Design an enzyme around this catalytic site. Sequence first.
Site, mmCIF file in Angstrom:
data_model
loop_
_atom_site.group_PDB
_atom_site.id
_atom_site.type_symbol
_atom_site.label_atom_id
_atom_site.label_comp_id
_atom_site.label_asym_id
_atom_site.label_seq_id
_atom_site.Cartn_x
_atom_site.Cartn_y
_atom_site.Cartn_z
ATOM 1 N N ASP A 6 1.072 -1.365 -0.355
ATOM 2 C CA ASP A 6 -0.040 0.101 -0.332
ATOM 3 C C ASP A 6 0.939 1.244 -0.117
ATOM 4 O O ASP A 6 1.608 1.802 1.008
ATOM 5 C CB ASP A 6 -0.607 -0.048 1.080
ATOM 6 C CG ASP A 6 -1.938 1.303 1.710
ATOM 7 O OD1 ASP A 6 -1.973 2.046 0.169
ATOM 8 O OD2 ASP A 6 -2.676 1.445 2.174
ATOM 9 N N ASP A 61 -1.259 5.947 -5.560
ATOM 10 C CA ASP A 61 -1.574 4.681 -3.641
ATOM 11 C C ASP A 61 -2.084 2.924 -4.546
ATOM 12 O O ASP A 61 -3.425 2.978 -5.267
ATOM 13 C CB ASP A 61 -3.208 5.864 -3.649
ATOM 14 C CG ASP A 61 -3.649 4.787 -2.760
ATOM 15 O OD1 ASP A 61 -3.451 3.074 -1.986
ATOM 16 O OD2 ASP A 61 -4.572 4.487 -2.157
HETATM 17 O O1 LIG Z 1 -8.777 3.344 1.428
HETATM 18 C C1 LIG Z 1 -8.671 2.134 0.819
HETATM 19 N N1 LIG Z 1 -7.586 1.650 0.803
HETATM 20 C C2 LIG Z 1 -6.377 1.837 2.007
HETATM 21 C C3 LIG Z 1 -5.398 1.020 2.163
HETATM 22 C C4 LIG Z 1 -6.321 0.027 2.341
HETATM 23 C C5 LIG Z 1 -6.255 -1.376 1.633
HETATM 24 C C6 LIG Z 1 -7.075 -3.015 2.364
HETATM 25 C C7 LIG Z 1 -8.329 -2.275 3.075
HETATM 26 C C8 LIG Z 1 -8.886 -1.161 3.129
HETATM 27 C C9 LIG Z 1 -7.866 -0.173 2.929
HETATM 28 C C10 LIG Z 1 -5.378 3.069 1.567
HETATM 29 O O2 LIG Z 1 -4.706 3.425 2.142
HETATM 30 C C11 LIG Z 1 -5.768 4.757 1.180
HETATM 31 N N2 LIG Z 1 -5.143 5.557 1.394
HETATM 32 C C12 LIG Z 1 -4.700 7.005 0.920
HETATM 33 C C13 LIG Z 1 -5.731 7.066 2.962
HETATM 34 C C14 LIG Z 1 -7.340 7.944 3.056
HETATM 35 C C15 LIG Z 1 -7.252 8.555 4.724
HETATM 36 C C16 LIG Z 1 -6.697 7.842 5.545
HETATM 37 C C17 LIG Z 1 -4.931 6.931 4.726
HETATM 38 C C18 LIG Z 1 -4.030 7.270 6.006
HETATM 39 F F1 LIG Z 1 -2.839 7.826 5.911
HETATM 40 F F2 LIG Z 1 -4.654 7.197 7.322
HETATM 41 F F3 LIG Z 1 -3.500 5.527 6.514
HETATM 42 C C19 LIG Z 1 -4.272 6.690 3.542
HETATM 43 C C20 LIG Z 1 -9.677 1.754 -0.599
HETATM 44 C C21 LIG Z 1 -10.297 2.552 -0.422
HETATM 45 C C22 LIG Z 1 -11.260 1.686 -2.310
HETATM 46 N N3 LIG Z 1 -11.889 2.377 -3.287
HETATM 47 C C23 LIG Z 1 -13.124 2.741 -2.381
HETATM 48 C C24 LIG Z 1 -14.271 3.968 -3.451
HETATM 49 C C25 LIG Z 1 -13.045 3.562 -4.711
HETATM 50 C C26 LIG Z 1 -11.884 2.322 -4.732
HETATM 51 O O3 LIG Z 1 -10.663 2.483 -4.577
HETATM 52 C C27 LIG Z 1 -10.613 0.107 -2.396
HETATM 53 O O4 LIG Z 1 -11.841 -0.334 -3.633
HETATM 54 N N4 LIG Z 1 -9.664 -0.662 -2.091
HETATM 55 C C28 LIG Z 1 -9.639 -1.518 -1.929
HETATM 56 C C29 LIG Z 1 -9.713 -2.866 -1.075
HETATM 57 C C30 LIG Z 1 -9.026 -3.381 -0.820
HETATM 58 C C31 LIG Z 1 -7.699 -2.651 -2.060
HETATM 59 C C32 LIG Z 1 -8.464 -2.165 -2.755
HETATM 60 C C33 LIG Z 1 -9.337 0.340 -0.515
#
Ligand SMILES: O=C(N[C@@H](Cc1ccccc1)[C@H](O)CNCc1cccc(C(F)(F)F)c1)c1cc(N2CCCC2=O)c(=O)n(C2CCCC2)c1
Length: 370
Positions: A35, A220
């Site tokens: 990530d 990301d």
């Molecule tokens: O928010 C998401 N990803 C996180 C990490 C994560 C991995 C697995 C499960 C849940 C979350 C990223 O870290 C997001 N980075 C930006 C971020 C936003 C807010 C807070 C933070 C921080 F630093 F505090 F962590 C970071 C997210 C967000 C997703 N979404 C929601 C709407 C479209 C999209 O791509 C999504 O589909 N995923 C999928 C689930 C498994 C991985 C792909 C994940």
Amino acid sequence: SFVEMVDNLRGKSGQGYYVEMTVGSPPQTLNILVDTGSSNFAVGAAPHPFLHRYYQRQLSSTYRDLRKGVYVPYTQGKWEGELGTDLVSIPHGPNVTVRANIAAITESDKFFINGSNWEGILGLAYAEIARPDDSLEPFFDSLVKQTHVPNLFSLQLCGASVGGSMIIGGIDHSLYTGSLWYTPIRREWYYEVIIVRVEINGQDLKMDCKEYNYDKSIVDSGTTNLRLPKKVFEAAVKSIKAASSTEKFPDGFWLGEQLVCWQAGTTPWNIFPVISLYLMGEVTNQSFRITILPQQYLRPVDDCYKFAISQSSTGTVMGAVIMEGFYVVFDRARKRIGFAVSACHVHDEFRTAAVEGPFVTLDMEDCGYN
Ligand SMILES: O=C(N[C@@H](Cc1ccccc1)[C@H](O)CNCc1cccc(C(F)(F)F)c1)c1cc(N2CCCC2=O)c(=O)n(C2CCCC2)c1
């Protein structure tokens, strides 16, 4: 040196990409989602119905409690737990062992996904966004400090279930063709970049470029979609609709509410437009562009697909939709991100994903929000 890391990544669809790791002594094996958009290393450490395996602190003699809780909320999902340190390796990575901070995840909500095959998360960005704060050193920072691994990694995510490579410590020329083109990291927190122009089918969206980076624009690997700020998203959808008007679709498609189907083999790719992002370059008034095809932003699950561009209110997120077309080099030592045409990108017999430059763009600094 790096053939050993080629193909060290696996996954499913939009369930992230994961690498194999070991924690503690004796080594416990877990699969960890990679990530680039966070900065905490964290692992399931208690029963959960979506986990088949978990980390057991009792039976590692190298564990250390730090006696401090921690909480992390993402765009999707959230978790809380307990901090400590332990010895960690990456089996198909460099031959080294490091002592890293690790969150033992105690409760969570809409984080773990059923049948996903991964049990934790490896936050590869910078300390500035670590919870609980600044001072919890992320994994890569420990790696670099504790060993002689060079301070860069590179990702090639293949969207074929799904695979790829994470080359820790350098760049592997078998994973890309053409040249690498580089954009500055604007600030060390997220892997923040500046988008300076957007085109849909060669036509400019004609907005104040500040809007493209409103809040921020980041790269990301832990996000599925190309996410775009409100204003940009609609404008994008208008142009995408018009270029594809030769056929009509439910309003729920454009919102990712739906799904859309055609006779296996017959998908009308050609009626769908190319999207280009221009990014700030390395030299004065110099930019380059990355171009993606509908094969990247229509993601498959009759052959059926979901529209993987979506709205955001926290800025632009260049997730897997963007990354699957490219080899992406996170060159922390020079504060820059390189893009190149990935060796495993999905070809159209008519069109290709591209990385092109140089182009000229004035006032690029001005495109970034404050
Ligand atoms: O928010 C998401 N990803 C996180 C990490 C994560 C991995 C697995 C499960 C849940 C979350 C990223 O870290 C997001 N980075 C930006 C971020 C936003 C807010 C807070 C933070 C921080 F630093 F505090 F962590 C970071 C997210 C967000 C997703 N979404 C929601 C709407 C479209 C999209 O791509 C999504 O589909 N995923 C999928 C689930 C498994 C991985 C792909 C994940």
